[PDB]
C-alpha cells in the first residue's frame, strides 16, 4: 500500500549554475530534502514502499532499489556515482516510473508520483510526455509536482489530468516544509485537509514541424496534427 | 409483592411459554404474572428445565 | 507433490482442486471415470462407484489407461484398495451381452466358461426360453438385469447401429440451423463412443439444451425413434422440436396422446406418454390397435423424458412392453426420494453425462440465479394454536401466516415496479385462493380447464399489464411456462428436493432470482433446508433475508389486529 | 490494544520511556489517520503555532475525526497548550529516527510458540515450565480452582486460541506488563526493550522468558547478544459449509475441531464441516460467532483471496444466525410488587425508583415496576414510611 | 483514421411514443439511451458536432442547432422528457431541415443523419422519392433505427443514400445499435486553444468549462490534451522479439537494443504506447 515514486530533476547544468550563483541552495541541500521525505514516507505506515529516480542528461538511474540506514546510504552513493543535450529529459523518467509501479502492482495498492522539477521545460518531448500522462490516468496514478523557479507548462497538465497537486515554492531552503505539508498525505487523507488550489493551467500544443507552443493554429481533420500558420495541405499523409 | 425471574423474548416465542402454563407440561404455577407481549415473568427454580424445552423446540427444525 | 490436483481416498472419493493449471485436463478425465457428488467454486468432489467404471470402459479407455492416469494425477499415490477395485470392476465388462434379433431377446457370451457359471443361479434358470447363447424371456428382462449385476457380470446395451441390415433407416437428418453448444457435444461424444450407441442417462438443465440432444441422438442413430413424455403437454412440445431441427414431414411425426391421433400406426417417430403405454385397464379400440402394432416392432433409441418418474411401479412396466435396442434417458433433476435412483442404473443404463451447473452459468447458457430464503416471524395470534395441536391442521397455520402474507405482497410490488414477470408457486390450494383474491391476481387453480389454463398463460407473456400468476402444483414438470423472471414460492410440498429444482428451472430459462417464503419457528424451517440439500450440490448459494427493504412503510395488507383475527376464524374453521 | 494501555499512564514514566530508536517510532506508528500528519508538520518547528489553527486545517466534512485524533494525541501527552509545541523529549528522539544521532531463526520460532499453545489443549507434550503455568493463571485464561494435575481452560482461554498471531501476543504481553510492577522490574525499561526488539541485570531475566515463547534465539546457553525472530515484529471455505485446510500442524487441526467436525484427514490436507450442531457446541462455552469469522479471514487460502469478497456471505451470517438461537430467552433477575388500589402511588413510586438505576421494565396499563433484589431491600423501606 | 462527422439525430415524437415494450414510456427510453449516445460520441470523435431534431404533428422543429457542445445537448434532452407527443411525424420535413443546413458543410467531412423512428406512418405534404435523389447528390448518409416493424420507405432511404436500417429486438439491442454509430467511417480547420483556465484567445470571451466554439467571433475552442489521445495510431510502435535484469522495471526492443521483460512487454505496447528506451 501507498507506493510513492519520487522523480528528482538531477540536471547537472542547472544545478551547477546555482552552485556558482551562491543562492545558498545546492543539490546536496535538495537530495537530502528528498531523503527526509523518503524516510518520512516509510514511517506513516508499516507496509509502505519507496522508489527514487534521478533525471540526468541522456540517463535516468533508479536510486533506492539497487532500516533507513541502508535506505539512505544507497541514495547517497548513487548521486556520488551518477553526477560524476543541454536540456534535461523528464518523460524518460516518468516512463520508468509507470513501469516500476505496474510491476509492483502485479505482486499484490494505490500509487503516486512526485516530481521535483528544477530546470525549464523541454517542448521537444511533448509527443512522448503526453503519452505517459494518459497511461498514468488509466491506473489512477497521481502525478504530484513541485517546481522551484519557473512554471513548467507541461507539468501543470500532468497534475490536472491525473488529479494531483501543483505547487510552486517561493523559497528554496524551505523546500522540506512544503514537501511535508502537501505531498506527505496520501490520496485518501488528501480529502480531509486544506491544500492550495491550482491557480493556472498552461494548455497549448506543439506544431508537428517546429514544436513551438501555439495558442491559435490549424488542425487537420483526419490526422488531428495541429500546425502553425501555414495550412497548405496535410503534411503527414 | 411477588418474586420472579424476568424473561424477554420474541412474541412468537412468548406464546410458547403461555402454552406451557395452561398445559401442565412441567409444573402448575409456571408463569406468575404476564406483563407484556414481549416480557413474561416466570418462577426461578424451573428456568433450566424451561431452557431445555425451548432447545427442544429449536431442534425440531434442523 | 504440489501439482497433480487430486486426492484418492481409500474407500473411494476424489477431491479435485478446481484452481490448478491442469484442471481442464483432469475434469475431462474424472467425468469419464467417476460421478460428481458436490461442485462448489473451489474444490470439487467426485466418487468412484461400480457403475461409473462400467461407463468408463464402455468408452475406449482400457483398464491400464485408467490406473496409469490416476498415478500421474494423484498427489498421494493410489492406496491399493482403489487399485484392486478398478481392476475388479473393469476386467468383467464384456463377457455377457444382451442382444435381440427379430423380436427375441438373447443372452450371449463369448467365453463359454461364464455360461457354465451363469446357468446355476436359481432365478436365471427361471427366465430361459465361440458363441454360446440361450434365449431369455422378454416379460422378465428386468429381473435378469438385477441378478446379472448381483453376480458382477453386468449387462451392456451397446446398439451396433452402423450395420444391422434389418431395420429400414429413415430419412431423419439434422438440419444446418441447430448449432449445438460445447456441453451438448461432450454428452453425445460419451454416448456414441466407438461408433455404437449406448443406453445411458444424460442430465442437462431444462432451460439448457435438454431436447436438442434428444433430437440429435435420433438424428444420429437414424432408426425408428420413440419419444416418451410425462404429460400430454410434453408430447405437444416434442413434435414442435422435431419440426424445428430435424426436417421431418407431417406424415411421420405421429402422436399417441388420445385427442388427435394423427395415424399412429405405421410411422417413424412416435411421441406418446407414460400411462398410455402402461395403461393397466381396458383400453379403447383405437388405442388397442396401435398397442398391438407397437408391441411387435423393434425400435432404436427410445427417449424417456422425465427419467426420475420411471422407477415407480407403473412407469417401469413400460420398458418390458416395448422392445428397443438403445434407451436414452433425458432429465433435469435426477434426485428423488425413497432411494430408487440406484434402481435406475439397470433399467436404462449407466449415468453418461452430468452438466456442470456453475459452468453453464459462468458461460451465459443459464441465467445467474440469486437464491434467497426470506423467513417471516410468526404472528402471536397464530402461534397460540400452532403448538396446541399436532394433527395436520398446523400445515394450514404456517402457510396462511399473516406475516407471510406481507412478505409476498411486498415482493410482488417490489418487482412490479421493476417490470419483472412474477410466478407465485403455492401448493395447498386453500392458501392459493386466499392469496390470489386478496391481491386480485389470476391463478391456475389446477381444476380449471384446458381452455382458461391457456389464456391465463399467454396474457402473462405478451402483455405488460398482467404481471403475476398464482400456480398450484401444475408447474412441477416440463411445461410451457413463459419465461418468468422471479419466482415467489410459498409453502410447497414437504421435503422433496426434486420439486425445488424444478421450480428453479422456471427461472433460468443478477438477471433472474427466486424467493422462498418460510414461516420461521415452525416445521417449514426443517423442510426448507431439506430442499436446498440438492441445490447446494450445484453451487447455488441460499441467502437469508430476515427483514426486508422497508416492509413497514408501504400499503401492506393485514395491518391491524381486527383484520388479523378474522383470518384465524377462517383458517381454523375448516378442520 | 497499545494506546489503550498508554492512555491510562502517568506522565512521570512516559518522559523516561522515550528512547531514540524504540518508543518514539512505536507510538508514532499507531496514531489513527491524521495524528501522524500533525506530528510530521510541527516536527521541525520551534515556535508554538496558535491553538485555533489545527481546527481549521481540516474540512467541515470529517470534522469529527479531528477531535478524536487530538484527544488521543493530547492523551499520550505529546503536545500541550503552552500559552501547541510538542514535547521536547518526544520531538528530539523522533528526529533521531529520521537519521539523527538464517532460516534457523524462523523454524525455531514457530515450533517454540506452538508448544505454548499446546498447553491450552489436552496434550501430553505440554510446555513443562512451572513459572509459565502460574503466569497464565494470574492472567485469567487457565482456571484451576484446585492444585490439579492438569490445569483447565476457561471461557477466556477458548477465545485466546482464535485470536490473530500478532494480536494474541499483544494480549499476552499486556498481562505480563501489568503484573511486573510488583514482581519484576520497572515498566519503563521492559516496554522500551520490546519496541527496540520490534526493529540492566534484571533485563536478562526477562530475556529468558521470551526464550520460552520464542522471540529471541540464544543457541549457546545465555551468550552475550541474542537473535530476534519473526514473532517479534509486533485454508478454503465453500458454499456447502465445507472447509478444506492445507495444514499439517497438529495445533491448527484442533483449532478447527473447536467449531467443526472432522470427516477425513489426508497428509497435507484436512477436510472438515461447519454444521449447526458444532458451532452451537462451541458457542455453549463461548467462542462467539464474531470470533469464528475473524478466524477464517486471517487464515484464508490464496485462492480465496481473489476478486470475490473473502468468506462468502452465505456462510458468514449462517454462523451469525446460529449464534442467535442462544440469544432467545435472555433471563434477568428481578422482584415485583403490585396489588395497590391507589391510582397515584404506582406513579408516585417512579420518583423513588429510577434514580438508583435498579428498575428493569416499565409498564403503563397496570404499571408493574420490577426492581433487582440487590436494590429491593431499600425500596421496601420507602413504601411503609410514606 | 476516421474523419469529421456532422451527425443529426432525428427523434420521433408521435402518438406511438407512449407505448410499452420498453421502459414504461417509449420516448423516455429513447431519450435515456440518447444521452448516453452523445457522451460516447464526443469521446471517440474530438472535433465533431451533433444536432437533434424532433418531429410532431406533421412538422419538424430543430431542438438544438448543430454545435459541438457535449453539455448543451444533454441538458436539452433532459428538458424534453415531458413532451406531449401528439400527432403523426413527418420524414420529408425532417430531412429538409437536416438538409438546408447540412448542405453547407465543407466537402472533406462525413455528413450523416440518424433517424430514430417509432411510428409507422410519415404523413408529409410532398413526395419522398425526390429527396432520396437529392440526398444522394449532397452525399448525405442517412441511417434509420426503427421500432417494432419494417417500413418500406425506411429501407429505400437507407440503402440508396448509403446508411443502414435495423429494427429493435429489445432495450439491450437498442443500446448495441447506437454503439455502432459512435465509430467514424474510415482540409485544415482553424481552432484556438484555451490557455488560462478556460478563456478565448481570439476575443477574450470568457465562458464556462466547455470545448464549444466561440459564440462571438465564431472560432472553435478545443482542448489540446483531448486531441493528444488520438495520436500513437499514426507512427505507431512496433512489436518486439524475445528469446533477469530489465530496463523498464529493473528486475527485446530491436530499435535501441534495450532488454525488457514479460510484464513490461505487455505494458509498453498496450498502455504506454511509447518505448521507454527510445525517448532517451
Ligand atoms: Zn491528415
Ligand atoms: Zn509550427
Ligand atoms: Zn473569440
Ligand atoms: Zn521489465
Ligand atoms: Zn526502443
What 3 state SS string does D332-383 have?
Answer: ECCEEECCCCCCCHHHHHHHHCHHHCCECCCCCCCCCEEECHHHCCCHHHHH
CA dist E121 to D20, D269, E26, E90, Å? 87, 72, 17, 8
Measure CA of the first residue to CA of the last residue in chain B; give whole Å.
42
A233 three-class SS: coil
C568 vs B contacts (CB less than 8 Å): none
Query: Using CB atoms, which residue from B16, B60, B61 is nearest to C383?
Result: B16
With touching defined as 3 or more inter-chain CB pairs under 8 Å, the answer for chains B and E is no
> What phi, psi does C413 have (nearest 5°)?
-70, -35
Minimal CA–CA distance to E232: which of A217, A142, A133?
Answer: A133
Where are chain A's structural domains? 1-193, 205-237
E108 vs A contacts (CB less than 8 Å): 221-222
Contacts of C185 (CB under 8 A, 6+ apart): none
Q: Does E170 contact chain C (CB < 8 Å)?
A: no
With touching defined as 3 or more inter-chain CB pairs under 8 Å, the answer for chains D and E is no
**Annotation-wise, does C223 bind a ligand?**
no
**Annotation-wise, does C77 bind a ligand?**
no
Our CA-based measurement puts residue C513 at a distance from the nearest CA of chain B, in whole angstroms, of 25
Beta-carbon separation of C542 and D244 below 8 A: no
Please give the distance, rounded to the nearest whole angstrom, from the Cα atom of residue E125 to the centre of ligand 5: 65
State the DSSP H helix or E strand holding residue C228, giving kind and residue range, or none if neither: strand C225-229
Please say whether the beta carbons of C504 and C514 come within 8 A. Answer: yes
The CA distance from C143 to C313, in Å, is 14
CA E79 from centroid of its chain's CA atoms: 21
b/e sequence C93-117, b meaning 16+ C-beta within 10 Å: bebbebbbeeeebebebeeeeebee
Beta-carbon separation of D333 and B32 below 8 A: no
Please give the distance, rounded to the nearest whole angstrom, from the Cα atom of residue A90 to the centre of ligand 5: 17
| Longest CA–CA separation in chain A, Å | 63
Determine which of D236, D237, D239, D319 to mutate to test the interface with C (most C C-beta atoms within 10 Å).
D239
What are A202's three cell numbers? 498552461
**Annotation-wise, does C204 bind a ligand?**
yes
| Burial status of residue A193 (CB atoms within 10 A of its CB: 0-12, 13-18, 19 or more) | middle
D370 vs B contacts (CB less than 8 Å): 6, 41
**Closest chain B CA to residue D333:** B5
CB atoms < 10 A from the CB of C181, how many? Answer: 14
The CA distance from E177 to D305, in Å, is 39
Beta-carbon separation of D99 and A39 below 8 A: yes
How much of chain B is in helix, strand and coil states, percent to nearest 5? 35, 20, 40
Query: Could you give the strand order of the β-sheet that contains C96-100, starting from the edge strand earlier in sequence?
Result: C96-100, C105-109, C132-135
Q: Does A218 contact chain E (CB < 8 Å)?
A: yes
Count interface pairs A-E at CB distance under 8 A: 142
The CA distance from D257 to D273, in Å, is 9
Q: How many angstroms is the resolution?
A: 3.5
Q: Does D44 contact chain A (CB < 8 Å)?
A: yes
HSE on the CB side for D301, CA within 13 Å? 16
Please say whether the beta carbons of E222 and E46 come within 8 A. Answer: yes
Minimal CA–CA distance to D68: which of D39, D35, D40, D37?
Answer: D35
C340 three-class SS: coil
Query: Which residue precedes each gap in chain A (C to N above 2.5 Å)?
Result: 66, 84, 108
Residue listed under C-alpha cell 502492482: A105
Beta-carbon separation of D264 and C42 below 8 A: no
Q: Give the DSSP letter string of D125-158.
A: S----HHHHHHHHHHTSS--SS--SS----HHHH
The CA distance from A192 to D61, in Å, is 8
What are D7's three cell numbers? 492512555
Please give the distance, rounded to the nearest whole angstrom, from the Cα atom of residue A210 to the centre of ligand 5: 24
Please give the distance, rounded to the nearest whole angstrom, from the Cα atom of residue E161 to the centre of ligand 1: 26
Residue listed under C-alpha cell 487399485: C83
Please say whether the beta carbons of C554 and C409 come within 8 A. Answer: no
C499 three-class SS: helix
What are C348's three cell numbers? 436404462
Please say whether the beta carbons of A214 and E193 come within 8 A. Answer: yes
Query: Which residue precedes each gap in chain E (C to N above 2.5 Å)?
Result: 186, 243, 251
Please say whether the beta carbons of D279 and D319 come within 8 A. Answer: yes
> What phi, psi does C16 have (nearest 5°)?
-115, 130
How was this structure obtained? cryo-EM
Beta-carbon separation of C42 and D313 below 8 A: no
CB atoms < 10 A from the CB of C564, how many? Answer: 18
Minimal CA–CA distance to A168: which of A197, A132, A191?
Answer: A197
Our CA-based measurement puts residue C15 at a distance from the nearest CA of chain D, in whole angstroms, of 10
> What phi, psi does C493 have (nearest 5°)?
-65, 160
CA dist C341 to B33, C311, C345, C434, C499, Å? 57, 7, 7, 38, 16
How many domains is chain B built from?
Answer: 1
Query: Using CB atoms, which residue from B8, B39, B58 is nearest to D325?
Result: B58
> What phi, psi does C489 have (nearest 5°)?
-80, 125
b/e sequence E25-50, b meaning 16+ C-beta within 10 Å: bbbbbbbbbbeebbeebbeebbbbbb
Please say whether the beta carbons of C373 and C206 come within 8 A. Answer: no
Contacts of C530 (CB under 8 A, 6+ apart): C495, C497
The CA distance from C410 to C71, in Å, is 57
> What phi, psi does C294 have (nearest 5°)?
-75, -25
**Annotation-wise, does C208 bind a ligand?**
yes
Minimal CA–CA distance to A181: which of A170, A196, A171, A191?
Answer: A196
The CA distance from E105 to A216, in Å, is 22
Contacts of D123 (CB under 8 A, 6+ apart): none
Minimal CA–CA distance to D86: which of D28, D173, D128, D171?
Answer: D28
b/e sequence C500-538, b meaning 16+ C-beta within 10 Å: bbbbbbbbbbeebbbbbbbbbbbbbbebbbebbebbbbb
> What phi, psi does C273 have (nearest 5°)?
-115, 165
D97 vs A contacts (CB less than 8 Å): 43, 68
CB atoms < 10 A from the CB of D35, how many? Answer: 23
State the DSSP H helix or E strand holding residue C459, giving kind and residue range, or none if neither: helix C451-459
What are C441's three cell numbers? 391476481
Measure CA of the first residue to CA of the last residue in chain D; give whole Å.
51
Contacts of E165 (CB under 8 A, 6+ apart): E143, E144, E145, E146, E150, E154, E155, E157, E158, E159
Q: What are the E-state strand segments in chain A?
A: 3-8, 49-55, 60-62, 111-117, 142-147, 166-168, 205-206, 213-214, 218-220, 226-227
Our CA-based measurement puts residue B15 at a distance from the nearest CA of chain C, in whole angstroms, of 6
Query: Using CB atoms, which residue from B3, B10, B58 is nearest to D335?
Result: B3
Q: Which residues pair with D350 in a beta bridge?
A: none
Contacts of D204 (CB under 8 A, 6+ apart): D222
D56 vs A contacts (CB less than 8 Å): 194
CA dist D182 to D99, D111, D178, D186, D206, Å? 37, 31, 9, 9, 14
Window D:93-152, CB contacts with A under 8 Å? 97-99
With touching defined as 3 or more inter-chain CB pairs under 8 Å, the answer for chains B and A is no
C40 vs D contacts (CB less than 8 Å): 238-240, 242
Please say whether the beta carbons of A194 and A114 come within 8 A. Answer: no
The CA distance from A99 to A92, in Å, is 11
C15 three-class SS: strand
| Burial status of residue D111 (CB atoms within 10 A of its CB: 0-12, 13-18, 19 or more) | exposed
CB atoms < 10 A from the CB of C342, how many? Answer: 10
Amino acid at each position: 500500500l501507498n507506493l510513492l515514486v519520487i522523480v528528482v530533476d538531477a540536471n547537472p547544468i542547472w544545478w551547477g549554475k546555482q552552485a556558482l550563483k551562491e543562492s545558498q541552495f545546492t543539490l546536496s541541500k535538495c537530495i537530502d530534502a528528498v531523503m527526509v521525505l523518503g524516510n518520512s514516507h516509510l514511517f506513516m505506515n508499516r507496509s509502505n514502499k519507496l522508489a527514487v529516480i534521478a533525471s540526468h542528461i541522456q540517463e535516468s538511474r533508479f536510486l533506492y532499489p539497487g532500516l533507513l540506514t541502508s535506505a539512505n546510504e544507497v541514495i547517497v552513493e548513487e548521486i556520488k556515482d551518477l553526477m560524476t543535450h543541454t536540456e534535461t529529459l523528464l518523460a524518460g523518467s516518468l516512463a520508468k516510473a509507470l513501469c516500476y509501479i505496474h510491476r509492483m502492482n502485479k505482486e499484490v495498492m494505490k500509487s503516486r508520483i512526485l516530481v521535483i522539477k528544477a530546470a525549464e521545460d523541454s517542448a521537444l518531448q511533448y509527443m512522448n510526455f503526453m503519452n505517459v500522462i494518459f497511461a498514468a490516468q488509466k491506473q489512477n496514478i497521481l502525478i504530484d509536482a513541485c517546481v522551484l523557479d519557473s512554471d513548467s507548462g507541461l507539468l501543470q497538465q500532468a497534475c490536472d489530468i491525473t488529479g494531483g497537486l501543483y505547487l510552486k515554492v517561493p523559497q528554496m531552503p524551505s523546500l522540506l516544509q512544503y514537501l511535508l505539508w502537501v505531498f506527505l498525505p496520501d490520496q485518501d487523507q488528501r480529502s480531509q485537509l486544506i491544500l492550495p488550489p491550482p491557480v493556472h493551467v498552461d494548455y497549448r500544443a506543439a506544431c508537428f514541424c517546429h514544436r513551438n507552443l501555439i495558442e491559435i493554429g490549424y488542425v487537420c481533420s483526419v490526422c488531428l496534427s495541429i500546425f502553425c500558420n501555414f495550412s497548405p495541405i496535410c503534411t503527414t499523409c | 409483592v411477588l418474586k420472579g425471574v424476568l424473561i424477554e423474548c420474541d412474541p412468537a416465542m412468548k406464546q410458547f411459554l403461555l402454552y406451557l402454563d395452561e398445559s401442565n407440561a412441567l409444573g402448575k404455577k409456571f408463569i406468575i404474572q404476564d406483563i407484556d407481549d414481549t416480557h413474561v415473568f416466570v418462577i426461578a427454580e424451573l428456568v433450566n428445565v424451561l431452557q431445555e424445552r425451548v432447545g427442544e423446540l429449536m431442534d425440531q427444525n434442523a | 507433490h504440489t501439482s497433480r490436483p487430486l486426492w484418492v481416498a481409500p474407500d473411494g472419493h476424489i477431491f479435485l482442486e478446481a484452481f490448478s493449471p491442469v484442471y481442464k485436463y483432469a475434469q475431462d478425465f474424472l467425468v469419464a471415470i467417476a460421478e460428481p457428488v458436490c461442485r462448489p467454486t473451489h474444490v470439487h468432489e467426485y466418487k468412484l462407484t461400480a457403475y461409473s467404471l462400467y461407463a468408463a470402459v464402455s468408452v475406449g479407455l482400457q483398464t491400464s489407461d485408467i490406473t496409469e492416469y490416476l498415478r500421474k494425477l494423484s498427489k498421494t499415490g493410489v492406496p491399493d484398495g482403489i487399485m484392486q477395485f478398478i481392476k475388479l470392476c473393469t476386467v468383467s465388462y464384456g463377457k455377457v451381452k444382451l442382444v435381440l434379433k427379430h423380436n427375441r431377446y438373447f443372452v450371449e457370451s463369448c467365453h463359454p466358461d461364464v455360461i457354465q457359471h451363469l446357468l446355476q443361479d436359481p432365478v436365471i434358470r427361471e427366465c430361459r426360453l465361440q458363441t454360446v447363447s440361450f434365449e431369455v424371456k422378454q416379460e422378465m428382462i428386468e429381473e435378469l438385469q438385477k441378478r446379472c449385476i448381483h453376480l458382477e457380470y453386468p449387462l451392456l446395451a451397446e446398439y451396433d447401429f452402423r450395420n444391422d441390415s434389418v431395420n429400414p433407416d429413415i430419412n431423419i437428418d439434422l438440419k444446418p440451423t441447430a448449432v449445438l453448444r460445447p456441453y451438448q457435444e461432450k454428452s453425445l461424444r460419451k454416448m456414441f463412443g466407438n461408433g455404437r450407441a449406448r443406453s445411458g442417462v444424460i442430465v442437462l438443465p431444462c432451460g439448457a439444451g435438454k431436447s436438442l440432444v434428444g433430437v440429435t441422438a435420433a438424428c444420429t442413430v437414424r432408426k425408428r425413434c420413440l419419444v416418451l413424455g410425462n404429460s400430454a403437454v410434453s408430447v405437444e412440445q416434442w413434435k414442435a422440436q422435431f419440426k424445428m431441427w430435424s426436417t421431418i414431414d407431417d406424415s411421420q411425426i405421429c402422436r399417441f396422446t388420445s385427442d388427435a391421433k394423427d395415424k399412429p400406426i405405421g410411422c417413424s417417430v412416435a411421441i406418446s406418454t407414460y400411462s398410455m403405454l402402461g395403461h393397466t385397464t381396458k383400453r379403447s379400440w383405437e388405442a388397442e390397435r396401435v398397442m398391438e402394432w407397437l408391441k411387435t416392432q423393434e425400435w432404436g433409441l427410445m427417449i424417456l423424458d422425465e427419467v426420475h418418474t420411471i422407477p415407480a411401479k407403473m412407469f417401469r412396466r413400460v420398458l418390458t412392453i416395448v422392445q428397443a435396442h438403445c434407451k436414452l434417458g433425458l432429465t433435469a433433476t435426477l434426485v428423488r426420494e425413497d432411494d430408487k435412483i440406484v434402481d435406475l442404473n439397470f433399467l436404462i443404463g449407466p449415468k453418461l453425462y452430468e452438466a456442470n451447473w456453475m459452468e453453464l452459468q459462468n458461460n451465459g447458457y443459464i441465467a445467474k440465479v440469486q437464491c434467497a430464503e426470506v423467513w417471516c416471524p410468526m404472528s402471536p395470534e397464530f402461534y397460540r394454536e400452532y403448538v396446541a395441536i399436532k394433527t395436520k391442521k398446523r400445515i394450514l397455520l404456517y402457510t396462511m401466516n399473516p406475516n407471510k402474507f406481507r412478505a409476498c405482497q411486498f415482493l410482488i410490488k417490489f418487482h412490479e415496479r421493476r417490470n419483472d414477470k412474477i410466478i407465485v408457486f403455492a401448493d395447498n390450494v386453500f392458501a392459493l385462493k386466499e392469496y390470489a383474491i386478496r391481491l386480485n391476481k389470476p391463478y391456475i387453480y389446477g381444476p380449471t380447464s384446458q381452455g382458461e389454463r391457456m389464456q391465463i398463460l399467454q396474457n402473462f407473456k405478451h402483455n405488460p399489464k398482467i404481471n403475476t400468476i398464482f400456480i398450484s402444483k401444475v408447474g412441477d414438470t416440463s411445461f410451457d411456462l413463459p419465461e418468468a423472471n422471479v419466482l415467489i414460492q410459498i409453502s410447497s410440498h414437504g421435503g422433496s428436493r426434486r420439486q425445488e429444482a424444478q421450480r428453479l428451472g422456471r427461472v433460468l430459462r443478477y438477471n433472474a432470482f427466486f424467493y422462498s417464503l418460510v414461516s420461521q419457528d415452525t416445521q417449514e424451517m426443517a423442510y426448507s433446508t431439506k430442499r436446498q440439500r440438492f441445490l447446494v450440490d450445484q453451487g447455488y448459494s441460499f441467502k437469508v433475508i430476515t427483514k426486508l427493504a422497508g416492509m413497514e412503510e408501504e400499503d401492506l395488507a393485514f395491518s391491524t389486529k381486527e383484520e388479523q383475527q378474522q383470518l384465524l376464524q377462517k383458517v381454523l374453521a375448516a378442520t | 490494544n497499545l494506546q489503550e494501555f498508554l492512555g491510562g499512564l502517568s506522565p512521570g514514566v512516559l518522559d523516561r520511556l522515550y528512547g531514540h530508536p524504540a518508543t518514539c517510532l512505536a507510538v508514532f506508528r499507531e496514531l489513527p489517520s491524521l495524528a501522524k500528519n500533525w506530528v510530521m508538520r510541527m516536527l521541525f518547528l520551534e515556535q508554538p503555532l496558535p491553538q485555533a489553527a489545527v481546527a481549521l486545517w481540516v474540512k467541515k466534512e470529517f470534522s469529527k475525526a479531528q477531535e478524536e485524533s487530538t484527544g488521543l494525541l493530547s492523551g499520550l501527552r505529546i503536545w500541550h497548550t503552552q500559552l501547541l509545541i510538542l514535547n521536547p523529549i518526544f520531538r528530539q528522539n523522533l528526529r533521531i529516527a529520521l537519521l539523527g544521532g538464517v532460516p534457523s531463526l524462523d523454524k525455531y520460532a514457530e515450533e517454540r510458540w506452538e508448544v505454548v499453545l499446546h498447553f491450552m489443549v489436552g496434550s501430553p507434550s505440554a510446555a513443562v515450565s512451572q513459572d509459565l503455568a502460574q503466569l497464565l493463571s494470574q492472567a485469567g485464561l487457565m482456571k484451576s480452582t484446585e492444585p490439579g494435575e492438569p490445569p483447565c481452560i476457561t471461557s477466556a482461554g477458548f477465545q485466546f486460541l482464535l485470536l490473530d498471531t500478532p494480536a494474541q501476543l499483544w494480549y499476552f504481553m499486556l498481562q505480563y506488563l501489568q503484573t511486573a510492577q510488583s514482581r519484576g522490574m520497572d515498566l519503563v525499561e521492559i516496554l522500551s526493550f520490546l519496541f527496540q526488539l520490534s526493529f540492566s541485570d534484571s533485563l536478562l531475566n526477562f530475556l529468558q522468558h521470551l526464550r520460552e515463547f520464542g522471540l529471541v534465539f540464544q543457541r549457546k546457553r545465555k551468550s552475550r547478544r541474542y537473535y530476534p525472530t519473526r514473532l517479534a515484529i509486533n485454508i478454503v471455505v465453500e458454499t456447502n459449509y465445507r472447509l478444506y485446510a492445507y495444514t499439517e500442524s497438529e495445533l491448527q487441526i484442533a483449532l478447527i475441531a473447536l467449531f467443526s467436525e472432522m470427516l477425513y484427514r489426508f497428509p497435507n490436507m484436512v477436510v472438515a464441516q461447519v454444521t449447526r450442531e458444532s458451532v452451537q457446541q462451541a458457542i455453549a462455552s463461548g467462542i462467539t460467532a464474531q470470533q469464528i469469522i475473524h478466524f477464517l479471514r486471517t487464515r484464508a487460502h490464496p485462492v480465496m483471496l481473489k476478486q470475490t469478497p473473502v468468506l462468502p456471505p452465505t456462510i458468514t451470517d449462517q454462523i451469525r444466525l446460529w449464534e442467535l438461537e442462544r440469544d432467545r430467552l435472555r433471563f434477568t433477575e428481578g422482584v415485583l410488587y403490585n396489588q395497590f388500589l391507589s391510582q397515584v402511588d404506582f406513579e408516585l413510586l417512579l420518583a423513588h425508583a429510577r434514580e438508583l438505576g435498579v428498575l428493569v421494565f416499565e409498564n403503563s396499563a397496570k404499571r408493574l415496576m420490577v426492581v433487582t433484589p440487590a436494590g429491593h431491600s431499600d425500596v421496601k423501606r420507602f413504601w411503609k414510611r410514606q | 483514421l476516421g474523419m469529421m462527422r456532422h451527425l443529426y439525430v432525428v427523434v420521433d415524437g408521435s402518438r406511438t411514443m407512449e407505448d410499452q415494450d420498453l421502459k414504461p414510456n417509449r420516448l423516455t427510453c429513447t431519450l435515456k439511451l440518447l444521452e448516453y449516445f452523445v457522451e460516447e460520441y464526443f469521446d471517440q470523435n474530438p472535433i465533431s458536432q451533433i444536432g437533434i431534431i424532433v418531429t410532431k404533428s406533421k412538422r419538424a422543429e430543430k431542438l438544438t442547432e448543430l454545435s459541438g457542445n457535449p453539455r448543451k445537448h444533454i441538458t436539452s434532452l433532459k428538458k424534453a422528457v415531458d413532451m406531449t407527443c401528439h400527432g403523426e411525424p413527418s420524414l420529408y420535413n425532417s430531412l429538409s431541415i437536416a438538409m438546408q443546413t447540412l448542405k453547407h458543410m465543407p466537402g472533406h467531412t462525413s455528413r450523416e443523419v440518424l433517424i430514430i423512428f417509432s411510428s409507422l406512418t410519415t404523413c408529409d405534404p410532398s413526395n419522398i422519392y425526390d429527396l432520396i435523389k437529392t440526398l444522394k447528390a449532397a452525399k448525405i448518409r442517412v441511417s434509420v433505427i426503427g421500432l417494432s416493424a419494417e417500413v418500406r420507405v425506411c429501407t429505400v432511404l437507407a440503402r440508396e443514400t448509403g446508411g443502414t436500417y435495423h429494427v429493435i429486438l429489445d432495450e439491450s439491442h437498442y443500446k448495441e445499435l447506437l454503439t455502432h454509430h459512435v465509430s467514424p467511417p474510415p482540409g485544415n480547420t482553424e481552432p484556438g486553444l484555451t490557455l488560462g483556465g478556460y478563456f478565448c484567445p481570439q476575443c477574450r470571451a470568457k465562458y464556462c468549462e466547455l470545448p464549444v466554439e466561440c459564440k462571438i467571433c465564431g472560432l472553435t475552442l478545443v482542448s489540446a490534451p483531448h486531441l493528444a489521445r488520438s495520436y500513437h495510431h499514426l507512427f505507431p510502435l512496433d512489436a518486439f522479439q524475445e528469446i533477469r535484469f530489465c530496463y523498464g522495471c529493473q528486475g527485446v526492443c530491436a530499435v535501441c537494443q534495450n532488454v525488457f521483460c514479460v510484464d513490461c512487454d505487455v505494458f509498453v505496447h498496450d498502455s504506454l504506447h511509447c518505448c521507454p528506451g527510445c525517448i532517451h
